[PDB]
């Protein structure tokens, strides 16, 4: 048969009960009354066995979870979303050899981990109040 | 060309994986261990650089509540479903479920407290009320619970009437608002089959239809006895119409 009163995220198994879709959890395994609800599970939040890994953030979605490499890093394989740690391929951006930095002429692009900074050109003096080796460095 | 032990990040622990020394370009990731979770975009690992140099990591864990509580009244609004980090003071919205309505005096919000526990949930969404059931002419209705969403009402006919409809009716989500599964049934009175016509006996006051508890009266013709067998009345059993005794006889 088939049930005609299932909630938002279930499939009719018998005419008397429903079953939660994958990615969604219920407090019972058979949904007897329609006042019970299926809710989305938090694959990202604690405690979740799945861990995305390095330089990667988890993003809970309805019926799914997505790992993506944090900004300042990129995947090698181009594949943005992955499922557990063994698929992590996140690598730091060379912001220097890409030219998409914001240091000025008095400085030089300095590739770091997830970002960059600005060092004085060899033979250049940072103005006294400003600090060297930072994104707002000005030298003379 | 070598590496050494990784730093000690406060409130986090590295996954050494049983490595005494590390080659260059190896990377070890720290993990917030107890009550802490990672900031989005922060650096959770430190790679080993040339000359055994390790990258500097700012503390990237922070106090955090766990997942917003499961509520039967409502669910997390759409922006808030993706979030997995909840520092102290985090507000989250809520929207009422399919068969529920907002109680305007309350707040569709609850925030993270310094006890790493969410603020006490309130029932800011109450169940919808299906319309009033009405009244079955020549029939009863039993409302054991109430008209709120997800309650079944039963249907009953008065004696001598027969229902042609659904035994009960329950109220379920109907597009925007709630509504009853089954319309109101109809009670129709049972009719006794036909009045037997007596030989040499007139039947007083015939009507077009004869219902329940009705007694049909006989009289004998002139010169005929046994007018005192009385009359018969209309009885109904399990939807079948029966006359009580045999029809009286004229002699
Ligand atoms: C960790 O969480 C706390 C709040 O639980 C953040 O506190 C902020 O602190 C700054 C000053 O240091 C205040 O001006 C902000 O108003 C605070 N925000 C809140 C929501 O209380 C703290 O910054 C967090 N640490 C981070 C983000 O690294
Ligand atoms: C639902 O239907 C299946 C198959 O008809 C049955 O095995 C199961 O027991 C049913 N659930 C009940 C009766 O609660
Ligand atoms: C998790 O990673 C392991 C790596 O050993 C892989 O075999 C497995 O398929 C992954 N799990 C899922 C559900 O993809
Ligand atoms: Ca999910
Ligand atoms: Ca970089």
Residue numbers in the entry:
A (entry chain A): 25 to 164
B (entry chain B): 34 to 284
Sentences from the paper on this structure:
Adhesion GPCRs are characterized by variable tandem adhesion domains followed by a common GPCR autoproteolysis-inducing (GAIN) domain at the extracellular region and a canonical seven-transmembrane (7TM) domain at the C-terminal region. CD55 is a GPI-linked membrane protein with four short consensus repeat (SCR) domains at the N terminus. CD55 regulates the complement cascade by inactivating the C3 convertases and plays a critical role in inflammation and pathogen defense.
Herein, we report the structure of the adhesive domains of the CD97–CD55 complex as determined at 3.19 Å resolution by X-ray crystallography. The CD55 and CD97 bind roughly antiparallel to each other involving each N-terminal tandem domains. Structures of CD55 and CD97 in the complex superimposed closely with prior monomeric structures, with a Cα r.m.s.d. of 0.9 to 2.1 Å and 1.1 to 1.2, respectively, suggesting no conformational change is needed during binding. In CD97 or EMR2, EGF2 and EGF5 each bind a calcium ion in the N-terminal tip, which contributes to rigidity within the interface of EGF1–EGF2 or EGF2–EGF5. Our complex structure reveals two N-glycosylation sites in CD97 (Asn-38 and Asn-108) and one N-glycosylation site in CD55 (Asn-95), but none of these carbohydrates are involved in the CD97–CD55 interactions. The preeminent interactions of CD97–CD55 come from the EGF2–SCR1/SCR2 interface in the middle region, which buries a total surface area of 1278 Å2 and contains six pairs of hydrogen bonds. In the third interface of EGF5–SCR1, Val-137 of EGF5 inserts into a joint hydrophobic pocket formed by SCR1 residues Val-60, Lys-76, Val-79, Ile-80, and Leu-82 and EGF2 residue Phe-79. In CD97, the Pro-71 and its preceding residue Thr-70 adopt a cis-peptide conformation, allowing the Thr-70 to flip its backbone and form a hydrogen bond to Glu-99 in the CD55 SCR2 domain. The majority of the interactions of CD55 with CD97 come from this SCR1–SCR2 pair, including six of the seven total hydrogen bonds between the two proteins.
